[PDB]
């Protein structure tokens with residue numbers, strides 16, 4: 120019993136479909152470092168996001184196809200977590216240590232940046248403008264507190280430095296995952312689908328046309344686990360598309376690959392800076408800059424950098440950093456996600472408002488223009504509807520904002536032949552614009568709140584009622600007490616399937632057993648038939664009592 | 666404390682009127698709707714403060730001429746000479762006044778910054794007056810729906826599944842009034858409650874085999890005696906119980 124208790128965390132168990140028609144149970148070893156890396160909060164958050172998006176967007180037919188991909192991505196991330204874990208050579212080692220320090224404390228730098236922005240704004244809360252020095256006016260900090268201006272200067276410098284550290288850290292730990300995902304997707308597309316061989320991408324596909332740059336670059340499979348994708352594509356499509364055309368498209372040399380296949384040399388790489396710069400692939404760097412610039416978080420951080428530099432140029436610009444609270448706190452993100460859920464419908468609704476108010480201006484310029492005199496003095500009238508530019512601007516700026524429509528601002532229509540017509544005009548403008556459209560605006564936000572809440576509830580219920588791997592309902596396992604918990608924690612646990620991949624990858628091919636070799640060979644062929652979908656061990660041997 | 670202060674000054678007793686909220690049950694339910702999303706509400710007012718502060722920042726640097734609230738020409742009263750007064754004015758007047766801050770601010774017609782001020786007023790009207798108050802109302806409405814859905818779910822779960830064994834009502838519904846008989850005689854909650862006292866009171870030497878077995882398992886914090894997933898009727902369905 121003591122040995123089993125000691126080795127319980129390291130004993131992983133999974134279930135596979137099997138070479139035969141019977142579900143088979145597989146036992147293997149889980150490394151301590153693998154479990155330590157898996158339990159990291161970042162990995163936990165990534166797994167939560169993956170589960171949420173998979174459940175919400177469905178994709179049942181591709182479920183396993185997504186899951187395996189997730190595992191691959193996650194593995195790369197924790198490799199980075201292993202790498203960034205806690206004359207020329209001296210500066211290089213200082214640079215790598217500094218980069219690692221920035222990578223480790225990125226979130227702390229974000230928190231410090233938010234706090235520094237709050238402090239800078241609180242200091243700026245004491246500005247005052249006066250004509251006399253402390254013809255145009257001057258600005259100065261009017262306060263009785265000492266050394267406030269030097270403190271503000273130091274806070275500005277520290278804020279910019281910390282934000283720059285944020286930029287460098289984010290480039291250190293987040294970009295390689297995006298690059299790896301893009302390389303993986305492009306490799307799958309050009310190896311199986313052949314989107315560039317005997318097929319072309321669509322013109323509207325911006326990313327499809329952008330991915331054409333790294334086709335012939337020597338560093339194409341960089342930042343990705345596989346480095347022989349181009350050779351496999353050549354072997355797959357040379358006999359049809361033409362070996363020479365494939366070589367030119369992928370930038371390969373048949374003689375070079377042949378001689379390296381026979382035997383390769385081991386030249387010494389020069390550590391010089393000039394030769395290193397010469398060895399930099401310009402096209403690959405251009406493609407990497409293009410893909411990284413399309414990211415949202417990187418653009419947000421670049422905007423934060425620009426705001427910091429403008430803050431050095433003019434201190435008041437730092438006020439913009441207050442909006443980072445929306446990106447900072449999670450409840451901020453949720454409540455503003457309600458607004459962003461129906462954003463297209465919202466810009467929609469304001470456009471419809473503009474059109475209907477334009478029609479009201481059209482019918483107000485042709486007949487009811489006399490009633491638009493906003494000048495009290497009789498000597499100099501001020502007609503706001505002499506031309507439709509002023510009339511439409513007046514209706515847009517005054518009629519929409521003023522409660523009760525445009526009739527309140529417009530003169531009294533009593534005592535005129537068009538009094539009934541003007542009454543209909545004002546009442547219909549009040550109902551159609553002030554009431555209905557703003558009601559739509561509020562209803563969109565309320566519906567978005569309900570939508571997000573329903574999505575979260577559906578995800579929770581789906582997770583709590585059905586198993587992720589086999590899909591069998593919780594009731595059948597609930598026949599036996601705590602059956603569902605045992606099934607979801609021991610038999611078909613997600614972490615066990617994740618760990619089995621690494622256990623296959625680390626150990627040598629000659630050490631794989633029959634089951635391990637079978638799973639590995641079917642994995643290579645992108646075949647997901649080993650997952651026990653629709654069946655499990657318990658019902659396989661229900662008569663035999665397992 | 667309120668009562669003692671009421672003795673000190675009688676008017677303090679007015680505070681006790683708020684006890685109606687704690688007193689009547691419907692009071693508690695309707696205010697539970699408000700308290701359901703309280704963090705989201707203090708949230709939303711904080712975001713309001715930040716966005717109005719940004720509007721004051723862009724109103725202190727350029728559009729400060731239009732903040733003269735004094736009718737007399739001899740003694741002007743600028744409300745945006747410093748950002749303390751400008752921010753207080755926007756917080757206290759702009760938010761409360763329907764239509765944004767443009768109504769209180771002077772007429773921008775006839776100036777080079779008239780279009781810029783039009784954008785300023787219209788965007789302050791939409792972003793502050795419309796969107797944020799819409800969020801405030803939507804949170805309360807969503808909380809009402811949340812509590813109602815919770816009560817409905819609890820009622821349905823109680824009325825459809827048995828609490829002890831968890832078997833659905835349909836299987837018992839095969840026999841007429843089967844679910845009622847099962848939930849009133851076989852797996853009644855009160856019977857399980859009473860059995861614990863019946864075991865605690867009687868002496869240990871008087872316990873039978875079944876009573877002694879349940880008692881020992883209870884003492885070891887083991888809950889395997891509860892018939893979860895099985896019951897008498899399906900145990901002897903072939904034998905007709």
Ligand SMILES: CCCCCCCC/C=C\CCCCCCCC(=O)O[C@@H](COC(=O)CCCCCCCCCCCCCCC)COP(=O)([O-])OCC[N+](C)(C)C
Nearest residue numbers: 474475476478479482484485486537540541543544545547
């Ligand atoms: C987005 C909503 C838009 C509609 C808002 C409706 C609110 C107001 C509704 C009604 C008040 C109508 C005006 C007062 C009556 C005047 C009579 C008249 O038009 O005869 C004219 C002749 O005929 C024409 O020139 C064309 C006749 C139709 C004009 C447009 C009517 C729009 C109806 C829309 C249907 C809406 C139904 C109900 C909607 C709730 C006389 O014109 P005049 O004096 O000889 O010349 C004038 C100068 N002019 C040459 C420049 C033209």
Ligand SMILES: CCCCCCCC/C=C\CCCCCCCC(=O)O[C@@H](COC(=O)CCCCCCCCCCCCCCC)COP(=O)([O-])OCC[N+](C)(C)C
Nearest residue numbers: 258433716717719720723725726727778781782784785788
């Ligand atoms: C929460 C919402 C916040 C934003 C509300 C926006 C409403 C209003 C929008 C627009 C009206 C803008 C003002 C009128 C035009 C003036 C030109 C100008 O700025 O040039 C200036 C030079 O340049 C600078 O000093 C910096 C330029 C940018 C200033 C800040 C713009 C904010 C944009 C936000 C993006 C919003 C996009 C749309 C949002 C719906 C000229 O300045 P000056 O006269 O030489 O010196 C003045 C005194 N000073 C030294 C103290 C500075």
Ligand SMILES: Nc1ncnc2c1ncn2[C@@H]1O[C@H](COP(=O)(O)OP(=O)(O)OP(=O)(O)O)[C@@H](O)[C@H]1O
Nearest residue numbers: 163167582583584585586587588607608611612613
């Ligand atoms: N094959 C499966 N593997 C794991 N969990 C499963 C599987 N199928 C269903 N589940 C669900 O997983 C739930 C348990 O979640 P789990 O223990 O994985 O949470 P977690 O990721 O540790 O949580 P947290 O969000 O706190 O980090 C069960 O309630 C069950 O409904």
Ligand SMILES: Nc1ncnc2c1ncn2[C@@H]1O[C@H](COP(=O)(O)OP(=O)(O)OP(=O)(O)O)[C@@H](O)[C@H]1O
Nearest residue numbers: 823824825826827828829830848849852853854855
């Ligand atoms: N094991 C169980 N024991 C008792 N009731 C159960 C059980 N499982 C489910 N129920 C549900 O409880 C309901 C009966 O509730 P009950 O008769 O206890 O109401 P009550 O609590 O006496 O009424 P009140 O709330 O007014 O006191 C049944 O409709 C049944 O669906």
Ligand SMILES: Cn1c(=O)c2c(ncn2C)n(C)c1=O
Nearest residue numbers: 190191192194195344345624
């Ligand atoms: C098959 N395979 C993988 O699936 C893999 C990997 N590194 C990460 N992953 C996910 N390597 C090196 C690999 O050969």
Ligand SMILES: [Ca+2]
Nearest residue numbers: 628629630631
């Ligand atoms: Ca072997």
Ligand SMILES: [Ca+2]
Nearest residue numbers: 869870871872
């Ligand atoms: Ca006895």
Ligand SMILES: [Zn+2]
Nearest residue numbers: 586588589611
């Ligand atoms: Zn399962």
Ligand SMILES: [Zn+2]
Nearest residue numbers: 827829830852
């Ligand atoms: Zn029962």
